[PDB]
Design a protein around this nucleic acid. Structure first.
Ligand SMILES: [Zn+2]
Ligand SMILES: [Zn+2]
Ligand SMILES: [Zn+2]
Ligand SMILES: [Zn+2]
Length: 119
DNA sequence: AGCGTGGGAGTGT
DNA sequence: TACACTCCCACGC
């Protein structure tokens, strides 16, 4: 499980299994973002081409992922997935606090809830 | 709230 | 590198 490709940038402990992953990560320290958005004077740019393509759905308005329950359409597949939990009632994130037995559909819901517990 | 919805990131083919 | 899937974090209401 050892990651041979380690970043040598000061203060960074990132390591990867592939050289391409490390080479892509190195663009974070250099700021290189070769994939610029050319829609309607947009200033967004990305180090990865797939991040640009996902972003450009903002301009085209395309919602490729449709809920098979309520037929609502969504720009991203991960947001479709968490949306469908509003139908199924799946809540895979439990608090684990002694008295609290609340569950949540998304991890960021549980993170906000955990902030209420102390002592 | 609970949940829409974006960037950033890791990893799969 | 292209493309696809997944998860975290964040903002907003
Ligand atoms: Zn680094
Ligand atoms: Zn754009
Ligand atoms: Zn739905
Ligand atoms: Zn709790």
């Amino acid at each position: 499980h050892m990651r041979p490709f380690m970043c040598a940038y000061p203060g960074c402990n990132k390591r990867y299994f592939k050289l391409s992953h490390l080479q892509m990560h190195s663009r974070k320290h250099t700021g290189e973002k070769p994939y610029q958005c050319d829609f309607k004077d947009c200033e967004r740019r990305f180090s990865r081409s797939d991040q640009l393509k996902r972003h450009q759905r903002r301009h085209t308005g395309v919602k490729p992922f449709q809920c098979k329950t309520c037929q609502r359409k969504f720009s991203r597949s991960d947001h479709l997935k968490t949306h469908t939990r509003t139908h199924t009632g799946e809540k895979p994130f439990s608090c684990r606090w002694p008295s609290c037995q609340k569950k949540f559909a998304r991890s960021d819901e549980l993170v906000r809830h955990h902030n209420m517990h102390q002592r």
